[PDB]
């Protein structure tokens, strides 16, 4: 009965010349996200929500860019290590919900693939992982296609 909630936010710039990787899925698009590794905005937000629910700080405190252990680590490896640390701190994950905000491309065809990657990385049943997607109605840098945002919420319980 010792439930805890966590919330996560991430954003990355979207420009020509890089791949678009969201939720572990490479998506064909004229632009891609800029960041240290694969720049997976959705997995970063979920990771931060999980560290937050466990009150373990955040993704920057756990996985520094200079650390040799995570030099070439992609964001799924980081999500899996996050989950291991959350479990070791005594918490079981109960569910994850999230939103991707991107003016383009359409993300609906890729939701089930993202959910399957996230559930596998968290060792969760598929029906405890949700990903939602929407545009920003052409408003702001998101609406002009200059960035993509992800939001995440996670519920855990201390066991």
């Amino acid at each position: 009965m010792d439930f805890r909630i966590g919330q996560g936010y991430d954003v990355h710039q979207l420009v020509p010349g890089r791949p678009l990787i969201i939720g572990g899925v490479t998506i064909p698009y004229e632009r891609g996200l800029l960041g240290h590794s694969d720049a997976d905005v959705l997995l970063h937000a979920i990771t931060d929500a999980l560290f937050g629910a466990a009150a373990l700080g955040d993704i920057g405190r756990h996985f520094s860019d200079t650390d040799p252990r995570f030099k070439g680590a992609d964001s799924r490896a980081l999500l899996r290590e996050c989950a291991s640390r959350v479990a070791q701190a005594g918490f079981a994950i109960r569910n994850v919900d999230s939103t991707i905000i991107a003016q383009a491309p359409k993300l609906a065809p890729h939701i089930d693939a993202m959910r399957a990657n996230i559930a596998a990385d968290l060792d969760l049943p598929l029906d405890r992982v949700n990903v939602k997607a929407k545009t920003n109605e052409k408003l702001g840098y998101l609406g002009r296609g200059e960035g993509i945002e992800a939001q995440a919420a996670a519920l855990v319980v201390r066991e």
Copy 2:
């Protein structure tokens, strides 16, 4: 004890010649929100939070903005159908919290009416529904009054 959390986000442009309908309340104003449905940004954010908590996808999955049957749709009717599907998936709603962010008009006079509408639609008492209203402190497209944003959080439990 099988609790789940969900989160929701929505935004719509503020334009001339549209009803301003937020939380089911038709608010007197020279502009209104632009969308395929009645464009109720607050009810959409809450709908997304509820679908997300039940791991049922999102409002685009259940009520496509491409579908003619939803042109001008009453978003309270959509919220009620969302709650019906969430119940059909086995979940009871425990509470909803939300934020509306707008430069104008003043929303304080309308918040209690919005809360009562949401509570009615979700078959909740008033004390389990909360609506918060704020400005964006003059920043960004929200500060310039180009759109209105809503955020939502929901807790459900699988019975």
Copy 3:
């Protein structure tokens, strides 16, 4: 006791010259500070709104329109009092600060300690996270700082 409730909070304040930068009750050296009627502590405000939201007590604007000169930790303490008054116990708080500058990492642990003391919580039930905005929008240009918060309470 299984009557859990969640709340969510959002705040943003402009960064302006000639004012202290106070976030999570920590005074951070910086050329600018946050603009507000209070000390404009955007993180404490977001947490405050999340707590009012979880207890279904409305929001800051309704509670804190005898507080004319109060700093935001006093308001967070008052918020926690009202949450308790309504029969709720706070179970945990999580939050994110979005600021392009300055670096907040050295100050996070003090913010967490401040929030924990104000809410009468142990450290392991309070969390503060910090991000830039990748140089995007008004946050990325350093025109404001945003905070987000989530809170879990239970009605006893």
